[PDB]
Design a protein around this ligand. Structure first.
Ligand SMILES: Cn1c(=O)c2c(ncn2C)n(C)c1=O
Ligand SMILES: Cn1c(=O)c2c(ncn2C)n(C)c1=O
Ligand SMILES: Cn1c(=O)c2c(ncn2C)n(C)c1=O
Lengths: 94, 94
């Protein structure tokens, strides 16, 4: 029986200017991931198949369902919130 | 026909102190996702099923294969490099 105990991020505040770019960050995070898989012989498939190297998320980011892009933008902001929580400043450059 | 064309992050340089925390960031990023999913009725399954909300990655982070932990650390780091290349400063708290 699995019960996740994440560290709480709900009070971590990021620059609005950073949240505004979360779509661009998720797309590129997706693209970097897809390049690596395709460079190692993965191809599009209906379900995740490690033994044959097939994955359904190997399509352009823009063609993903919006619920997935939503998950991906959340993960991108959760990552940076965890950075700030581990004690790093995040500031827009002048 | 899909050819990913990500932005090139190879020359983005992150503080080592932040790279040292890769596994902790990836673990919690995974844990926040699992908590969100389980709160919405998702449970473990052997393959992802959006309609019946089953997902194979709904296990503790520590129990994931090393190959997936590696992909998780690289994406956390790719997310942060993308943040730096969009013009934000990441520095240890002063
Ligand atoms: C589909 N997918 C993954 O499966 C994945 C990932 N990072 C780690 N993993 C496992 N990214 C960015 C991703 O898009
Ligand atoms: C398994 N999984 C996902 O499937 C996922 C995610 N972020 C977005 N997605 C879709 N994270 C962090 C994740 O661990
Ligand atoms: C760690 N991780 C995943 O494991 C993942 C994902 N999209 C799909 N998956 C499975 N993303 C964006 C992700 O960051």
């Amino acid at each position: 029986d699995y019960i996740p105990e994440p560290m709480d991020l709900s009070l971590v505040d990021l620059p609005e200017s950073l949240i505004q770019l979360s779509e661009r960050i998720a797309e590129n995070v997706h693209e970097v991931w897809a390049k690596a898989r395709i460079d190692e012989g993965w191809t599009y498939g209906e379900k995740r198949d490690d033994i044959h190297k097939k994955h359904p998320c190997l399509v352009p980011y823009d063609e993903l369902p919006e619920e997935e892009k939503e998950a991906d933008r959340n993960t991108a902001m959760n990552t940076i919130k965890m950075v700030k929580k581990l004690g790093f400043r995040i500031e827009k450059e002048d």
